[PDB]
Amino acid sequence: MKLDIKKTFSNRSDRVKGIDFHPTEPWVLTTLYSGRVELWNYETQVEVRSIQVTETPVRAGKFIARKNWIIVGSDDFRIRVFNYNTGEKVVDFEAHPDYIRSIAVHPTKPYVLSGSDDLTVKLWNWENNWALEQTFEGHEHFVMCVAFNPKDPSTFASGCLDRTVKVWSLGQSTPNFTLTTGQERGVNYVDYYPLPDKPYMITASDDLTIKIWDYQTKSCVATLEGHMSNVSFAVFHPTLPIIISGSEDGTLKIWNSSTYKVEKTLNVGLERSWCIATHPTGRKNYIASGFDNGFTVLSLGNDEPTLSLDPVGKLVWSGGKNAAASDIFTAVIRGNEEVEQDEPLSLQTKELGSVDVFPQSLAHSPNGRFVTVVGDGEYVIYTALAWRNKAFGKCQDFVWGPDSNSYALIDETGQIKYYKNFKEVTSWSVPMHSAIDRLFSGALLGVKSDGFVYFFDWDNGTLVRRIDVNAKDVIWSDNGELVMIVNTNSNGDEASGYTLLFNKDAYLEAANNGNIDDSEGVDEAFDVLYELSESITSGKWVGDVFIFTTATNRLNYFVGGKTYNLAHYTKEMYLLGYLARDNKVYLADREVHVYGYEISL
């Protein structure tokens, strides 16, 4: 992967010991060495509420959102709850005759965990008036960190400086098992891997190392040593295949959970790294951290490769090696470039602009006027000339209409919306009752449900036809007569695609008649001209000719039932377009290096 980190919100503050994300509200909570607690809207960069709780460091703070509470533990032996809507001290008691290090909140049950230097862990029931239900003994030193198994909240790990982790079920005075860590300086932190495909855990030590454990088989999977000083935390991101550690060396290390190699190192500049949080449900992939000098909120995306070519020859992409995933760049193509075959074109990168989301993909309007970037549930539309904004919104799919001034979406509820003039047509409705896999552009809006393909008239929305083919892609000719229906071949039983001719007349007649069969459409509007052999990875029409890439990486052309190979490349090659000026077709590889191939009989 190529991770990308955006610095959402940073606050210089006293030593930040505890830190937690609210799950619905864009709020980070922080517990300080100063006995003060803070609530920040990291998204509008505003301090909501802040309480002077104690003179003593408060080390553990967590959200119980469901009861609209914050819960915090200090060095005065105490546990205190507050309502954050009101700032009103709900509860305040003595929970251990020693420091309180760590707190865990039960996902569902009114159950709250606290770990202590008193050697013990303890269970607390709030809707039975905070009575101490069970006291877990066994550890022979400071209990640094408690953690519920997200997959089985009846059980929980506890990381201890006595060099062990101890998993217990709610009820037994004894542990199910006890994990000697080998980490001769002790465990500061423990975290569960959230996904059901691995029973992994993780620890972090003063001994500079991080350790991944299998808790079924009870064995050390891997040692991950980076850090130059004591490792403070190590956690699994809820959503990206990463581990995140932090430490007194001042750094944050983002590790890869598969290769166990450090993907990314950050020196936030707040000195020593104390504590960690990840937005519960991956929102913006937020992770937040606490330091000697304060806290930061970081969003983590990916620099996925994007490129759209325009008809007149302009390339536009996001990201890159020397650059950021959400920076936009543009480059012009001219027959200029000496026709050397398999070397990437050299062009001059001009800065074009920026965008607020992590692209997964990017695409010009048909006429090359506008650019749409799609990502992270959001779509955005920019002017290609001075990178001016023209539209934003949420979408699971975006497809451009012929006009180059209208489009269609699958929205946050999975329902097709149609915009005309950047300003939605409310009345335009296509009632789709199955689930919508996808959306295609071209001269009829294409909609994939089941192993089917529906074709609707752009202006009204009436089903022009339904094709019973499990399409991968749908690629139209520019003059609107031809279409190629690429087939998700799925074990080469069927042909890889089908040419179809579209009679618009046959549609319009069945339109006047009111004889459009709302299940199928119009049998006469679509005729199957040919079937295709080899698999199709991408493809452009150039008149009656279909230029296409294969999974053998070969470049072919199809014209009137015949497949002629034209070149045989040796990478993953994708088609970008056909410039007539340079009589040239243009290709892109996995690294966005652009190639040019020349075409004549």
């Binding site: 030593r15 010991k17 060495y33 460091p57 230097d117 400071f142 640094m144 400086l161 104390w274």
Partner: peptide
């Protein structure tokens, strides 16, 4: 030093 002190 013989004793570090996890008082932070």
């Amino acid at each position: 030093c013989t004793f570090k002190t996890k008082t932070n």
